[PDB]
Enzyme design. Structure first.
Site, PDB file in Angstrom:
ATOM      1  CG  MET A  88      35.662  36.070  24.314  1.00  0.00           C
ATOM      2  SD  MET A  88      34.840  35.437  25.785  1.00  0.00           S
ATOM      3  CE  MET A  88      34.643  36.939  26.757  1.00  0.00           C
ATOM      4  CB  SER A 126      35.353  39.649  22.633  1.00  0.00           C
ATOM      5  OG  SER A 126      34.884  39.979  23.925  1.00  0.00           O
ATOM      6  CB  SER A 127      30.016  41.494  22.466  1.00  0.00           C
ATOM      7  OG  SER A 127      30.498  41.334  23.792  1.00  0.00           O
ATOM      8  CB  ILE A 152      37.690  42.401  30.313  1.00  0.00           C
ATOM      9  CG1 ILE A 152      38.559  42.500  31.576  1.00  0.00           C
ATOM     10  CG2 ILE A 152      38.486  41.950  29.086  1.00  0.00           C
ATOM     11  CD1 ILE A 152      38.985  41.166  32.160  1.00  0.00           C
ATOM     12  N   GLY A 153      37.657  45.330  28.316  1.00  0.00           N
ATOM     13  CA  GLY A 153      38.450  46.407  27.727  1.00  0.00           C
ATOM     14  C   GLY A 153      37.770  47.118  26.568  1.00  0.00           C
ATOM     15  N   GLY A 154      36.439  47.075  26.535  1.00  0.00           N
ATOM     16  CA  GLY A 154      35.664  47.723  25.475  1.00  0.00           C
ATOM     17  C   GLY A 154      34.820  46.776  24.643  1.00  0.00           C
ATOM     18  CE  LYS A 163      31.935  38.070  24.454  1.00  0.00           C
ATOM     19  NZ  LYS A 163      32.603  39.240  25.074  1.00  0.00           N
TER      20      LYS A 163
HETATM   21  C1  LIG Z   1      36.942  43.246  25.366  1.00  0.00           C
HETATM   22  O1  LIG Z   1      36.689  43.658  26.522  1.00  0.00           O
HETATM   23  N1  LIG Z   1      38.201  43.068  24.981  1.00  0.00           N
HETATM   24  C2  LIG Z   1      39.306  43.307  25.915  1.00  0.00           C
HETATM   25  C3  LIG Z   1      40.195  44.347  25.252  1.00  0.00           C
HETATM   26  N2  LIG Z   1      40.554  43.601  24.064  1.00  0.00           N
HETATM   27  C4  LIG Z   1      41.861  43.657  23.683  1.00  0.00           C
HETATM   28  N3  LIG Z   1      42.884  43.788  24.552  1.00  0.00           N
HETATM   29  C5  LIG Z   1      44.096  43.791  23.905  1.00  0.00           C
HETATM   30  C6  LIG Z   1      45.393  43.947  24.619  1.00  0.00           C
HETATM   31  C7  LIG Z   1      46.542  43.323  24.128  1.00  0.00           C
HETATM   32  C8  LIG Z   1      47.758  43.487  24.797  1.00  0.00           C
HETATM   33  C9  LIG Z   1      47.817  44.273  25.952  1.00  0.00           C
HETATM   34  C10 LIG Z   1      46.668  44.897  26.442  1.00  0.00           C
HETATM   35  C11 LIG Z   1      45.456  44.735  25.772  1.00  0.00           C
HETATM   36  N4  LIG Z   1      44.021  43.658  22.543  1.00  0.00           N
HETATM   37  S1  LIG Z   1      42.401  43.517  22.060  1.00  0.00           S
HETATM   38  C12 LIG Z   1      39.517  43.610  23.044  1.00  0.00           C
HETATM   39  C13 LIG Z   1      38.530  42.597  23.628  1.00  0.00           C
END
Ligand SMILES: *C(=O)N1CCN(c2nc(-c3ccccc3)ns2)CC1
Ligand SMILES: *C(=O)N1CCN(c2nc(-c3ccccc3)ns2)CC1
EC number: 3.5.1.99
Lengths: 535, 531
Positions: free
Chosen positions: B149, B175-176, B196-198, B100
């Site tokens: 990302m 993001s990957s 960091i969020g999936g 990445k």
């Molecule tokens: C990969 O780990 N990630 C992180 C999670 N991500 C996203 N986070 C948001 C988001 C926007 C506003 C408030 C909380 C979270 N949107 S996409 C995808 C990429």
């Protein structure tokens, strides 16, 4: 309202009376027991005499409970007696352990010294107390702490003042002061303390005992009472305190087991690496004589040089090494990390309470508005830089600036590690603050935490081992002690370390994160070389 | 000023030309080599053929470099192109690894999609790139990422748009994304991503491959490029991505060595516990069919139930289990953790740059003053609670309020653990968001991160394994798909997951912190029973 610190005092008095009654009901039953021979046994020899069955758990418990009551009369270190008190297979089968008051215990208060916490018993034992019991240990007393645990002295308006077992006019250190005082007089063979800026190491050094501050997350913090929660920049650590290093090591081995990793799975399941601790290969030891921030006492300097020279004679290679940007690490990283909100959450615990004189002007300083904090800061800057820098970093911030700070801490951590790796170090030898300051002085000599708080900020294993005692030649040279800054902290430190002949002086051992068994291996070498007859 | 994204594009074009030249100079030299047979080898059989010497490292490198160039033509996943020294004793001796873009590499850009990072090459390799090389691996490509990302789509104004190797109109996840697209078409046997969020799990599920998000600090983050530094509430994790679970496990074993613990000693020296991964004792598996926040697609629901039933038939005991207060954990803990400063630090990267349409209104929303953020919030509240709660948690805070938040995260972590222990679970089975949204839709379906972001907030190992494919029965039932809230996120998700027949659907496997080998043992069971 806070005047009901008498409620805590009569509780403490009742605990002491229960102890006295228990010990004397046992003393009558066993008149032929040898207390003197029992108490002077090192924890290793003690545990294997329990494990074989040559000594009963009852014998060792009430003999130590006996000494605890006796040493408390001259030190005031016991806040309450843990009345409600063992698996045979456990590595600490019969061992009585003393606990710092912040370690929560079922049906008992963790009044950090504050009236706010008075009538509030714990519903449950904290994880480490559970694993001690599961390993056979018998937690028997809660030990005293300074009013908010934010002091390296040991006094609070509830249980009173704890004194150094060596000299009455001297501090036992803090915040694990009660612990240092009790173990330092032989009232306990093992104890647990916490350390967010030297709180295991100060009391260890001041009372002449061994202590270890592991990496922050090596042990469980689940169930520890504190004044502020959710501050993760400067790492809080809990660790053992004992009369020798082998006792620290045995304690760590016992804690680092399946019980600890099953209760609280957020702790990395790193078993005690025996092959590292029992190693005897020569070490590359980094060392420094002074941090160029707090000037060492002649007693400190002598202790550091002599341990260095013995290590050389042992066959270890000794390398000059000093972490970069220490003034930055303390004044902005450590001071700012602990007080990112300007102390507003900290000040919550003092609402309507007395402020113990051992805290100095900390409460007064923190209560000042941010603009006044700033105004005083650049007003002091030309003449007193240290005071100005500290004042400024004890101001409220946005979450944005907290992120900047937290990033700066991980950057600094990696820069010292890069420094460490380039020089190819195994361990690090550091001066430890000592002999031990006068009874109400630590609160106005804040700069002195420089040697310790650095490694909380860096989150490195750091241990302390007594190596020497202050000679009369050392105490005389305190008359020619001038600080690096000449500010109020240097002035107070000069007069506070004086009149200190015979008091123990220690040295500090540091290793890389997660290397506590290597840190203990090094502490064992220092103990072995400086106190060549201790077993 | 940002118009010089042409500079990045001609650099990308030159990388592709260098690849093509290298592959063709090799193909002329070895006309008798069987490419088809080589590429279809699972990493385990590939590495032991390297280790024995039946295959040369040169052969496997340019064969994979060849496929990479070919699959890139239809996916646009390679942003730049990165043996003679590869250490023999290493567990990944001849293995080409894709990276990445945020993984820093000497003399190469980590332009997270932003103009601000354009003419700025890395002076050094990051710790994980160093340990891959020391283990024998050959990192060969940087793969594409969405603009900041912070999107589970995959598009940026510099290198363009990445597409799903299964369906052109579909997103590869983010993001990957570049990673998912490349490994998903067999252009790489192994890759590294961050989450960091999936962001490991979305692209794995969308492109039909395996991925693992370890406990945040199981691996080194030393040298990873990001938009925001020093945010420690919601845990960032890096982990492997591959075509099967055994490849994920082999990668973890390789990374978890003396080299990794000597470089960056802040990583707990926990070696890969082989006896846990290779275990075959029956497991107590907690499961849920829906998080009561984002409604599963018929394809997701079927995948979860079928996996549950096969595990039961295998001899495992299956227990209903759902983490308490999920709405709280996402709306206040996760959303507030990622945006404690109101996104002021985040917005710094966008100054004077284009905003890629795949980001949606994120930039516009974060730019609003705190009082207006508040005003809109209680105005939306009666009709659209989700939107209101998110808006409110994306406001600036004092450091005092960050402490309160960070304390609340460790409290919640302990309460889910207490929940876990009482039920006496070994692992947890969870639906994974899928089949895969339309090309520009993830940016306006933010609530869909609910299934993944929870375990970043909790900081638990979480893995993803493809178990089934969308049948046309499943796609037809998307017409009867009504959300739980009926707000804009539910509307867009409805239209975004339709027209999706044949696309892979995955399931998510969770374990307790520091239990990634148990997590992989569980993922191997699901793969073994479903595939
Ligand atoms: C990969 O780990 N990630 C992180 C999670 N991500 C996203 N986070 C948001 C988001 C926007 C506003 C408030 C909380 C979270 N949107 S996409 C995808 C990429
Ligand atoms: C035990 O962990 N400790 C650490 C805290 N230590 C002290 N820290 C301060 C202080 C005051 C202002 C700014 C930074 C640090 N004073 S005492 C007590 C012992």
């Amino acid at each position: 309202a806070r005047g009901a610190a008498t409620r805590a005092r009569q509780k403490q008095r009742a605990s002491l009376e229960t102890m006295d009654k228990a010990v004397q009901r046992f003393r009558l039953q066993n008149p032929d027991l040898d207390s003197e021979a029992l108490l002077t046994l090192p924890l290793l020899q003690l545990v294997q005499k329990l494990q074989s069955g040559e000594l009963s758990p009852e014998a060792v418990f009430f003999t130590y409970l006996g000494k605890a009551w006796e040493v408390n009369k001259g030190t005031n270190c016991v806040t309450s007696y843990l009345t409600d008190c063992a698996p045979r297979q456990g590595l600490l089968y019969g061992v009585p352990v003393s606990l710092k008051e912040c370690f929560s215990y079922k049906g008992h208060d963790s009044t950090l010294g504050l009236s706010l916490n008075e009538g509030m018993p714990s519903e449950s034992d904290c994880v480490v107390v559970q694993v001690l019991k599961l390993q056979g240990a018998v937690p028997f007393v809660h030990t005293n702490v300074p009013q908010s645990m934010l002091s390296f002295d040991c006094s609070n308006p509830l249980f009173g003042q704890t004194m150094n077992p060596w000299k009455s006019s001297k501090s036992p250190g803090g915040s694990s002061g009660g612990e240092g005082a009790l173990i330092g007089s032989g009232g306990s063979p093992l104890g647990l303390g916490t350390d967010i800026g030297g709180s295991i190491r100060f009391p260890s050094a001041f009372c002449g005992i061994c202590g270890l501050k592991p990496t922050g997350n090596r042990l469980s913090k689940s169930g520890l009472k504190g004044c502020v929660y959710g501050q993760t920049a400067v790492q809080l650590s809990l660790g053992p305190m004992a009369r020798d290093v082998e006792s620290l090591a045995l304690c760590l081995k016992a804690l680092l087991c399946e019980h600890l990793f099953t209760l609280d799975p957020t702790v990395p399941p790193l078993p005690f690496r025996e092959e590292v601790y029992r190693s005897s290969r020569p070490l590359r030891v980094g060392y420094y004589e002074t941090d160029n921030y707090t000037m060492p006492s002649p007693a400190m300097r002598r202790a550091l040089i002599e341990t260095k020279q013995r290590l050389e004679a042992a066959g270890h290679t000794l390398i000059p090494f000093l972490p970069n940007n220490i003034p930055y690490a303390l004044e902005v990283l450590s001071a700012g990390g602990l007080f990112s909100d300007g102390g507003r959450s900290f000040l919550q615990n003092f609402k309507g309470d007395f402020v113990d004189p051992c805290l100095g002007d900390l409460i007064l300083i923190l209560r000042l508005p941010s603009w006044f904090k700033r105004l005083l800061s650049l007003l002091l800057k030309p003449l007193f830089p240290r005071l100005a820098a500290f004042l400024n970093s004890m101001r409220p911030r946005s979450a944005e600036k907290l992120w900047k700070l937290q990033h700066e801490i991980e950057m600094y951590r990696q820069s010292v590690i890069a420094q460490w790796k380039a020089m190819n170090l195994d361990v690090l030898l550091t001066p430890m603050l000592g002999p031990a300051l006068d009874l109400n002085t630590p609160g106005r000599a804040t700069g002195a935490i420089s040697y310790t708080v650095l490694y909380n900020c860096l989150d490195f294993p750091a241990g302390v081992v007594p190596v020497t005692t202050v000679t009369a030649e050392d105490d005389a040279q305190m008359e020619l002690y001038k600080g690096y800054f000449g500010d109020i902290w240097d002035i107070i430190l000069k007069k506070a370390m004086k009149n200190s002949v015979g008091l123990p002086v220690a040295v500090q051992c540091v290793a890389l994160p997660w290397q506590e068994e290597l840190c203990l291996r090094f502490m064992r070498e220092v103990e072995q070389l400086m106190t060549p007859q201790k077993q």
